[PDB]
């Protein structure tokens, strides 16, 4: 359906599956995985050459054409913010006789550039904020789609229009050059880029078509971590709450409960960047109950206390609408429910999951969903409250509402350590 380049994964290699059989050469510096993700690094032999099949279609100039792909771009270095912000580098180049298009990146900005035969250039970009508490784009997989017409060169992010550029002074742009996937610029040794599902179409993609392709390429049977990678079993995870973004979970001292504290922030003296720390709070690990975590799986939510693996439980018969979760050494207790069913209540793409507590795997009784609540803590005349790691029945009715509330305190995201994130 109007697709002229379809770079996908097959047999430890990238291949064009558009049906026009272009030649693809992946050099030894490009890392591949079966999840269709490939990585461009700063090593010289980290490149991909696409020699487009010149013997099948018009293949000289396209009036209308689009380019879609998913990208994951590492966080700036805390001590190398200058080179990050100033130095720009090309990631994908496609030109012949000094005319064509190129995708470049300068720091927190990705850039689409056109150049016609006469040398006239035009650009359109997307920029994500780097003063954010919790950024949705930094080091996280997101969906880029670039649409080119006679009038406008638009940039869509995650199915939504983000940028527009008037390109009527632009003439014919030579399109049939080699497509070189390589980092090109004055970059750091530690610079890299992840990409997946790269595609080129000989048409202007409607916003509807783009949002649709976004939803489709977002869909999976499995759940995903904070960065957007598949959620794994036996993998160490920090925990993030979409309801309380600046809040993390800590085992309260000399207690079996999880208190909720405020994330430490960037405390160096640069004004151009800011963030909340992600690698804080307890280290969690998900266990299977009888690899990759899938929807409706039954799991054990464990975490590491000291030199020991502990488990998150709930009390079976609490009378209020909510209750503090009980964090303990692993054990079989007829006093606790220990099995969580992992859930996805959102109909839209998200990296958030929910954690349901049920009586039995066979039974239909829903005990509640794991979240965060503000419990009474102390004081008579002046009542003081505290936020605790909890289970709540209130969430049950709430996840039914449409559209699904992202701000709900039962929406969790798991954060593994990533080379694309340093703090």
């Amino acid at each position: 359906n109007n697709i002229i380049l379809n770079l996908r994964y097959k047999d430890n290699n990238l291949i064009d599956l558009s049906g026009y059989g272009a030649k693809v050469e992946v050099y030894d510096g490009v890392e591949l995985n079966d999840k269709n993700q490939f990585k461009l690094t700063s090593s010289a032999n980290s490149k991909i050459r696409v020699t487009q099949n010149q013997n099948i279609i018009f293949n000289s100039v396209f009036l209308d054409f689009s380019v879609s792909f998913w990208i994951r771009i590492p966080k700036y270095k805390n001590d190398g913010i200058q080179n990050y912000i100033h130095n720009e580098y090309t990631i994908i180049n496609c030109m012949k006789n000094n005319s064509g298009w190129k995708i470049s990146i300068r720091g927190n900005r990705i850039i689409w550039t056109l150049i016609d035969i006469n040398g006239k250039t035009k650009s359109v970009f997307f920029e994500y904020n780097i003063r954010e508490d919790i950024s949705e784009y930094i080091n996280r997989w997101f969906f880029v789609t670039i649409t080119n017409n006679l009038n406008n060169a638009k940039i869509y992010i995650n199915g939504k229009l983000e940028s527009n550029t008037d390109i009527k002074d632009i003439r014919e742009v030579i399109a049939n050059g080699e497509i070189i996937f390589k980092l090109d610029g004055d970059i750091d040794r530690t610079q890299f880029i992840w990409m997946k599902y790269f595609s080129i179409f000989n048409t202007e993609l409607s916003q509807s078509n783009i949002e649709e392709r976004y939803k489709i390429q977002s869909y999976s049977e499995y759940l995903k971590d904070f960065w957007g990678n598949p959620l794994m079993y036996n993998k160490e995870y920090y925990m993030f709450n979409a309801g309380n973004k600046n809040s993390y979970i800590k085992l309260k001292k000399d207690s079996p409960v999880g208190e909720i504290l405020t994330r430490s922030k960037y405390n160096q003296n640069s004004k151009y960047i800011n963030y909340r720390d992600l690698y804080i709070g307890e280290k969690f690990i998900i266990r299977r109950k009888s690899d990759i975590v899938r929807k409706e799986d039954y799991i054990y939510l464990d975490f590491f206390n000291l030199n020991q693996e502990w488990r998150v439980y709930t009390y079976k018969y609490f009378k209020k609408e909510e209750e503090k979760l009980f964090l303990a050494p692993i054990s079989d207790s007829d006093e606790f429910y220990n099995t969580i069913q992992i859930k996805e209540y959102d109909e839209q793409p998200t990296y958030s999951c929910q954690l349901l507590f049920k009586k039995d795997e066979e039974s239909t009784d829903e005990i509640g969903l794991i979240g965060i609540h503000r419990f009474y803590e102390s004081g008579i005349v002046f009542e003081e409250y505290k936020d605790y790691f909890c289970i709540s029945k209130w969430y049950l009715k709430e996840v039914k509402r449409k559209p699904y509330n992202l701000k709900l305190g039962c929406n969790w995201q798991f954060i593994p350590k990533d080379e694309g994130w340093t703090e």
Partner: nanobody
Framework: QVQLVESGGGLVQAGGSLRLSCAAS????????VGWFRQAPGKEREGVSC????????AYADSVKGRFTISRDNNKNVVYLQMDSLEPEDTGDYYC???????????????????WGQGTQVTVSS
């Protein structure tokens, strides 16, 4: 600070009765479950009995049924422990604590309970 003042108890001969009282200092105790523990000198302190956030649900140690009866007055912010047929093996300092949870459990694990008071000594003589 935020504590749970205990009272009652003292010297009493074997077979008699006694009544302990927990009052909540600087917090409302109806939100929490509440438990009485005993501590003999040297030994670790064990759970004696406990009660739900409300009344209704109760739990006692197996060596305590059915001589003791725990109860709650949430209006007066006070927990009572009636003790009958006391044995000399009930001697020791009695501490009262509030739980993090609303749920009382026969387990009566020390870590679940906080806001401990200074306690009141009881002694039973043959």
């Amino acid at each position: 600070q935020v504590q749970l003042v205990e009272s009652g108890g003292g010297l009493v001969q074997a077979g008699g009765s006694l009544r302990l009282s927990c009052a909540a200092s600087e917090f409302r105790a109806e939100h929490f479950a509440v438990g009485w523990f005993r501590q003999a000198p040297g030994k670790e302190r064990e759970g004696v009995s406990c009660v739900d956030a409300s009344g209704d649900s109760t739990a006692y140690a197996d060596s305590v049924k059915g001589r003791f009866t725990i109860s709650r007055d949430n209006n007066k912010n006070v927990v009572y422990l009636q003790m009958d047929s006391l044995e000399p093996e009930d001697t020791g300092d009695y501490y009262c604590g509030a739980s993090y949870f609303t749920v009382c459990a026969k387990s009566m694990r020390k870590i679940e309970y906080r806001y401990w008071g200074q306690g009141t000594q009881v002694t039973v003589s043959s």
